[PDB]
Each structure stands twice: as C-alpha cells, then as structure tokens.
A paper describes a structure:
The SARS-CoV-2 main protease (Mpro or Nsp5) is critical for production of viral proteins during infection and, like many viral proteases, also targets host proteins to subvert their cellular functions. Mpro is necessary for the proteolysis of 11 different cleavage sites in the two SARS-CoV-2 extended viral polypeptides, which results in the liberation of mature non-structural proteins that are essential for host infection and viral propagation. TRMT1 installs the N2,N2-dimethylguanosine (m2,2G) modification on mammalian tRNAs, which promotes cellular protein synthesis and redox homeostasis. Here, we show that the human tRNA methyltransferase TRMT1 is recognized and cleaved by SARS-CoV-2 Mpro.
The 1.9 Å resolution structure shows clear density for the TRMT1 peptide bound to the active site in one protomer of the Mpro dimer. As expected based on alignment with the Mpro consensus cleavage sequence, TRMT1 Gln530 occupies the critical S1 subsite pocket in the Mpro active site, positioning the Gln530-Ala531 peptide bond directly adjacent to the His41/Cys145 catalytic dyad for proteolytic cleavage. TRMT1 Leu529 corresponds to substrate position P2 and occupies the hydrophobic Mpro S2 pocket, packing against Mpro residues His41, Met49, Met165, and Gln189. P3′ substrate residue TRMT1 Phe533 occupies the Mpro S3′ pocket, which is composed by Mpro residues His41, Cys44, Met49, and the backbone of Thr45. Additionally, the TRMT1 P2′ Asn532 sidechain interacts with Mpro Asn142. Analysis of aligned peptide substrates in the Mpro active site shows that both TRMT1 and viral peptide backbones have nearly identical conformations for the N-terminal P4 → P1′ residues. In the TRMT1-bound structure, Mpro Met49 is shifted to accommodate TRMT1 P3′ substrate residue Phe533 binding in the S3′ pocket, and the Mpro Asn142 and Gln189 sidechains are repositioned to form hydrogen bonds with the TRMT1 peptide backbone.
Author numbering:
A (entry chain B): 0 to 139, 144 to 305
B (entry chain C): 526 to 534
C (entry chain A): 3 to 300
The structure:
C-alpha cells in the first residue's frame, strides 16, 4: 500500500556531463558529451534579445572566446560553435572522459524520464516526470536535461529551455526540436488543455494490485469502444490497441485482463473513490508507464 | 513475519 | 511542486556487493571500510534468534566476499558495531566523497538509493515517519541501501536499510548501526506503532502553496497552540511543539501569515476536505516536505 513511489533513474552518469555555460551576462547549464557541449541557444540572448531574437544574427557576433564553459573548476577551451535547431553546440578541445554510453532519442507524450535539475552547471536534484499530452512538464534551470537508462546506455530525451506562465516547463529534445507548440522567445504562449494519460493510470492500477491494493477490482469487463466513450467524457486519452498490448506483461503477472482493469477504471471515473485511496493517493496517478512499474516492482538495476 | 532484506539462498 | 531527490552519483560510487556464504546484500564503501547490515552473516537457520557475536566469531576475513564492479576487494579485518558490520579492506575507495554520519529525527526527509547486488535501481525521496519506519520501495536483496542528504557538497548518510515489517513499511539503522525505533534485526513478530501525520511538514507545504500563489484554503481565524493540538490529534496528526513553531518562523515572515494563523487554516482543511480542489497538484495534505525543504525549493 506504500511500497510504490515515484522513482528516478540513478543520475551519476549524467552528473559527470553537466557544465556551466556563460555568454555575456547569461549563465545556464550545458551537457558535455565527447568533445561537444550542448545547451539552449538562447544563452546568446540578453533578457532584451529574448523579446524578438534573430538567432543566426546574434550568433555570428560571437567568437569562440565569447563562450565560457566551466567543468567544475576547469575552464574548457571552445574551438568551434554552431546551431542545430534550438540547441547550441560548442566544440571544445577535450573529450569528456566521463562520457557514458548514450544516444539522443525523442520521446512521445505520456512517456516518462528523470530530470537532473542543475543551476550554474551544478546538479541540484533529480525527479521523475512525464511528457504531458500537451507537451509540457510539471516540475521545479535552462539546459538541465531529461533521460532514461536502458542498462548502461543513457537515452537523453529532453533539455529544459523556458518556464511558462502557469509554471509548467517547455523544452526540446537534444537535437533542439521543441516538444509542443512553443518557441524560445519571450512572448505570450500558454499550454493547451491537458489530458490524463490513460495507459499510465492503468499501469498504476496494476502496480496497486501487485502491492495488495485491490478494493477497486470488480467482476465486470468492458470493450475498447465502450471504455473510450467514457474516457472522452472525462478528458482521458483514448485507449488504443497498442496500449492494451504493452500492458500485456502486467496483465499476465497479475492475471487481470486489460479490459477487466478498464472496467475498474471506468467505475472509478464514474463514481469516484468514495473516500478511499490507492497506493496512498486520492487521485488517479498517470506518470508511471507500464515499464516504470515493472522496473520498480522487479528491482531492475543499471 | 518481518523480513530481513538481504538475499538469502 | 515535486518531491526532489538529491543527485545520487556521489553515493553510487560507494555501493558494493557483500556476500557471506549464500547470503548477499549491499555495502557502503567509504575510504578503506565497507559498512553493511550484520545479518549478511545469517543463514536461513539464523533468522529468528541469531546470536550475532557467535555467528561472527566463526567468520574469518576471507569468508566475506566484497565486489566493487568487476574488482574483488580484499578484506583485511572485520568488526561489529551495534547492527552493522565494518569490513576493513586493503583499498581506499577512490570515489569516496566528502561525507559525515548523522542520526535523524522523525519528520526529517532524505533520498534513498535503492540497490541490489551492489548496483543501483533508482532514487526516491522519503521521510522518517513518526513511528520510526519509512515508506520505501525495497525488495529482496535491498538491505544495505542507504539514505542520505547532500545539502552543501557533503554527503550526510543517515539511514541504512535492514528489513521489511508486515505492513510493508521499512526499518533500519543509522550508520553506527543503531536502529531507528524499537525494532531488532530478527524475524520475530514485530509491528510498527500507529503512524501519524507530520504536522510541521504539512504546515510547511501549505506555506509552499501560498508562495506559489494559492490562498483559497486560508481563513480569517487564528488559534492557540493547545487548541490546535486538541483538534489535530483527532485526525491522527502529530502534536505541534513550540520548536516546530520556531522552525516555521522564516516561512511565516516570507508570506506574512502568522504560524498560528496557518494552523487555523489547517484545522478548517481537516474539517472540510478539499471539495474537489487540489493544493500543489495533490488531493491529500502532503507531509513529506520539511520547512527546510520548502525554503530550499522556493
Ligand atoms: Cl533531523
Ligand atoms: Na473488472
Ligand atoms: Na551467511
């Protein structure tokens, strides 16, 4: 009933990659992999440029020595600079000896990852979050990154850029493509209406069963079409057949069919929890993926 | 019963 | 408003595997000492009434198999301190961070690096409950995982994991091997006392909610400290002490809301529930953020 918490990936492999990047009066975080430091391109903007920035214009103004990169207390020598989408790439004269095995991946809304929050290049905290269906992140500095680990391979999927007026965050993948209809400009922008990640709620109900929280199970089953009619009503994402399939493992480990569990969720949506809790929560949690549940309940290590 | 949480084999 | 754990890299570099016989758990390698729970020297016949002094005197150094990654460390001495073993090894850990050992009090928060076979599975934030247990995810093989804070470049180790209690909550020691709470490293019948809500942390979290711009739950009332405790304890909340009132002083000054005025707000929230609303993304009153945590992340 309590043995299931939001669990982040161990962050040590990423901590060894975080550096401080300064251009003028702007300081943010950079990601040092091989001989390149990745960071948001708006590091070349004052708070004044940010009103209507012309990024290629502001960047040709800059010599390599306009970028101060510090790895702990060592200054890194910048020997080239270029832009890819909304990411600046600073080539340095030294390859990071702590570079882990890594790749750059773009994730889908609903998928989860750990963010290593940093300030001035120093790792400050780590937390597990989901890419919302409206492509924002609910979280805590620009250039902090998000990642998953697979066994020894770090999959970098997110770099933080902007804070939105609702406090949610917007960012890019590591090739500088934004998640969501956002731009790196100080301007009027706002997240679209969010929705609940249905497949993740179901995964978390399975985690509840695995941990002995079973009061919401019932005799009934439903159909995809019938469930989605209810899902649309309560601002839940439609449940697709691919979603049913990835729940197969959990559906087997617990011996509870997905559409069987959908009947529980339908009932929970229509009638509430009636003063009860599930895994210590009065709300239906949607930031655990099916694999997140397996990873925590099976003790997968890295 | 309470469980010591080493791995016993 | 997220629970944040500390970055775990400084602790990852200290985790090793310890095996004695066919029993295996995690160890913490700092300088030339590996610390681990003493019940690594138990067999399946030593779980109810182990005599650890007797089990240990039958062990030599080479009976302890310590693996750091692919390296096997040479144990050159061993002793028992309360409920932990200290294994002297012939190599200082080159990755040893600045560290200290601290014993914490209920209500304090810390990060847990859950490990199996000396390797990390993940990191989460938790609190020492008033009944001296913690609500972790800990599975078979997790003993020896540690809890820690890193407030200023220095790792403060405050918890080492030992055992699971029948309700699924977890019990362990400080790094000198003294248990938190009345528990013992035996599988004889034990149960945690009734758990209560950490009132001072709830109040800190309501201040956090005010700081992030939400005031819908305040009211125009105040309360005395004693009247507040008479009400709060009917909801299984911990008594609030003058010490706790002092702790909240900074957050009160930041918000302009007197501590006993926030206490009035909490009493009304206990009486009313949320009425379909949420505070900082939660439909329950959160009690695993300390006043220090809130000042930190705001
Ligand atoms: Cl303390
Ligand atoms: Na059912
Ligand atoms: Na043994």
């Amino acid at each position: 009933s309590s043995g299931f918490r939001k669990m982040a990936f161990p962050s040590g492999k990423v901590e060894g990659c975080m550096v401080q990047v300064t251009c003028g009066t702007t300081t943010l975080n950079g990601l040092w992999l091989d001989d390149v430091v990745y960071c948001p391109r708006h590091v070349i903007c004052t708070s004044e440029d940010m009103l209507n920035p012309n990024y290629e214009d502001l960047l040709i103004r800059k010599s390599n020595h306009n970028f101060l990169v510090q790895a702990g207390n060592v200054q890194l020598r910048v020997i080239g600079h270029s832009m890819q989408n909304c990411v600046l790439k600073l080539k340095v004269d030294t390859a990071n000896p702590k570079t882990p095995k890594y790749k750059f991946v773009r994730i889908q809304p609903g998928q989860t990852f750990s963010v290593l929050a940093c300030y001035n290049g120093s790792p400050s905290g780590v937390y597990q979050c989901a890419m919302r269906p409206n492509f924002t992140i609910k979280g805590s500095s620009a250039g902090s990154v998000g990642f998953n680990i697979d066994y020894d391979c770090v999959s970098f999927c997110y770099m933080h850029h902007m804070e939105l007026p609702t406090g949610v965050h917007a960012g890019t993948d590591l090739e500088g493509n934004f998640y969501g209809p956002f731009v790196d400009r100080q301007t009027a922008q706002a997240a679209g209406t969010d929705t609940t990640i249905t497949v993740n709620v179901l995964a978390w109900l399975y985690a509840a069963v695995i941990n002995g929280d079973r009061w919401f199970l019932n005799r009934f089953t439903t159909t995809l079409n019938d469930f989605n009619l209810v899902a649309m009503k309560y601002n839940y994402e439609p449940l697709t057949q691919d979603h049913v399939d990835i729940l197969g493992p959990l559906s087997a480990q617990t011996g509870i069919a997905v559409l069987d569990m959908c009947a529980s969720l339908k009932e929970l949506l229509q009638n509430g929890m009636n003063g009860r809790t599930i895994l210590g929560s009065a709300l239906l949690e949607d930031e655990f993926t099916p694999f997140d549940v397996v990873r925590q309940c099976s003790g997968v290590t890295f | 019963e309470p469980r010591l949480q080493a791995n016993f084999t």
